Amino acid sequence: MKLFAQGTSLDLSHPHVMGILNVTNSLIDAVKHANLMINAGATIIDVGGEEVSVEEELQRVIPVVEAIAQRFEVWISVDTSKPEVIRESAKVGAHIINDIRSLSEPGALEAAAETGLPVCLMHMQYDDVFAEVNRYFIEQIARCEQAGIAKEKLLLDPGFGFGKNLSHNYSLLARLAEFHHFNLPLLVGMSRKSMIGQLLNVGPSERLSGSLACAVIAAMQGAHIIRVHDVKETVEAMRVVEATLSAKE
Amino acid sequence: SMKLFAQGTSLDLSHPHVMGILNVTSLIDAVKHANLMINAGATIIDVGGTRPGAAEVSVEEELQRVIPVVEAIAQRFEVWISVDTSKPEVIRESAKVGAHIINDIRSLSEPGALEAAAETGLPVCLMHMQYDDVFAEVNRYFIEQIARCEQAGIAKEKLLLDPGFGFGKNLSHNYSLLARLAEFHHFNLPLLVGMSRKSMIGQLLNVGPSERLSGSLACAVIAAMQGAHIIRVHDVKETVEAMRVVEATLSA
Ligand SMILES: C[C@H](C(=O)O)c1n[nH]c2nc(N)[nH]c(=O)c2c1=O
Numbered sequence A: 001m002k003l004f005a006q007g008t009s010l011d012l013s014h015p016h017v018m019g020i021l022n023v024t025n026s027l028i029d030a031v032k033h034a035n036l037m038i039n040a041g042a043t044i045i046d047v048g049g050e051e052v053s054v055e056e057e058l059q060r061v062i063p064v065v066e067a068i069a070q071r072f073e074v075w076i077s078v079d080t081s082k083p084e085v086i087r088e089s090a091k092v093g094a095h096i097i098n099d100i101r102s103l104s105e106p107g108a109l110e111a112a113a114e115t116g117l118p119v120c121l122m123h124m125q126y127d128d129v130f131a132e133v134n135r136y137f138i139e140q141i142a143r144c145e146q147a148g149i150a151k152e153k154l155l156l157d158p159g160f161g162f163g164k165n166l167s168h169n170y171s172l173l174a175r176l177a178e179f180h181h182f183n184l185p186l187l188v189g190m191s192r193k194s195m196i197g198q199l200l201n202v203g204p205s206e207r208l209s210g211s212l213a214c215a216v217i218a219a220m221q222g223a224h225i226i227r228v229h230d231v232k233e234t235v236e237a238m239r240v241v242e243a244t245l246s247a248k249e
Numbered sequence B: 001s002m003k004l005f006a007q008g009t010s011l012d013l014s015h016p017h018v019m020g021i022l023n024v025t026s027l028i029d030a031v032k033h034a035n036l037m038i039n040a041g042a043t044i045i046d047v048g049g050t051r052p053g054a055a056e057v058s059v060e061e062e063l064q065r066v067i068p069v070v071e072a073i074a075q076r077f078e079v080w081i082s083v084d085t086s087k088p089e090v091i092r093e094s095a096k097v098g099a100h101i102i103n104d105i106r107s108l109s110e111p112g113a114l115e116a117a118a119e120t121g122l123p124v125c126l127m128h129m130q131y132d133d134v135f136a137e138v139n140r141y142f143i144e145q146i147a148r149c150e151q152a153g154i155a156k157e158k159l160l161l162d163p164g165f166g167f168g169k170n171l172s173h174n175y176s177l178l179a180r181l182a183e184f185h186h187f188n189l190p191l192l193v194g195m196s197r198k199s200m201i202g203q204l205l206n207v208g209p210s211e212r213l214s215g216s217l218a219c220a221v222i223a224a225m226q227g228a229h230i231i232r233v234h235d236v237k238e239t240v241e242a243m244r245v246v247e248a249t250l251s252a
């Protein structure tokens, strides 16, 4: 199970650490940061600046993708919902459209087909959160298939955070591997999220450990992309989960 | 459901537990390191005076080191206490002073240890150490020492099972055990594991003993999500943090 973008490939045969690059100096404060996270072992960067106008956003997020495409052989993930951004990021060398809104914005769906790139679908918004999020995946995977983006370019993200309380969150985390039925890759972002801040009662700086544990639980069920802030630590932990799932038969 | 019973008190093995490590190699300093682990969540304290090539201590030295420490805890905290020792005197004497778990990494193999672990009606932790299957070899070892114990005074509802992480097992042997670990629940006996800053993290990381925290946290959370009841760590504040999220996914 691989991804294909801008001529290259991503091997989802082992789990993958993606760092976060909120681009909200500036441009140099951005390439410095991505350098480090690549040094840490991030195999994808998640660039993003989000509301704001589509000119503010292009202004910020597009040059940063450019410098990274023309300095490191790392994969590049654009976090945005706007169609201009989708089509311009693709034209510079981005690999994954990452839309938290799931292509919902006017013309974003079509722009995402227009690029031929992998696109990541995340659930957002009766206590069957797993049915709720599965059927949201069953819906959107068809909405995109009608749009003509092949299912083999589709990535699933349950939507940790946002509007879900503690209970719902951890029911998803518990039933993560049940989404493997799609045969589609699973991206997960839980780092420093409130499902760790409430459980551990610590400022946003010190959630590193409850974080790491969410990263391992995900990965032990076969999650393919994990979206974090503390990359060096998550890579190291990801090293020993690969050592574990390789010891199986 | 499982629960461990010693010294007229119990132990809720349903949710996982974090065991700290109190190396005693003074006593003021031991009680201080006890309090901090207790604050950080430690439900058990392992008291220790067991490393390959380390100085052989005497039985006078041991009781000198370890017996005043269990005393200071038993009367100052409500925490459960494990003694890490392999000597019969240290067993009997520490049982007298309010010890809860006997932790013999040499599985009561010293002359008179089995007997001494009988005369004290406390739980004993069995530990495997030392071609076909390292899980097969470990399991047949638990099949053995579970019987030699039962024929001795003690019951099966007193035993703890622990495979042998560290102790010369190579990186795959180590990581294959961590992957078939839930299979040891077939015993229907508590699972205690210890992996903090071991060589399975030291090798696969190419990293010094200090900076194995993240690798260690991971091995704990893999072990916990498979149902290990007790987890032996130096970095306790960090382990109970990770176990809280483990508890949260296991539950909801
Ligand atoms: C704003 C927030 C954050 O960075 O904390 C956030 N932005 N973008 C995201 N994209 C994906 N695929 N999954 C996520 O969880 C996620 C986030 O949580």
Ligand SMILES: C[C@H](C(=O)O)c1n[nH]c2nc(N)[nH]c(=O)c2c1=O
Pocket: B050, B051, B052, B084, B103, B105, B125, B127, B162, B165, B166, B167, B193, B194, B195, B232
């Ligand atoms: C760090 C040291 C070593 O491996 O040399 C060591 N001492 N005492 C121990 N007791 C239990 N129950 N389990 C263990 O793994 C263990 C150790 O690993």
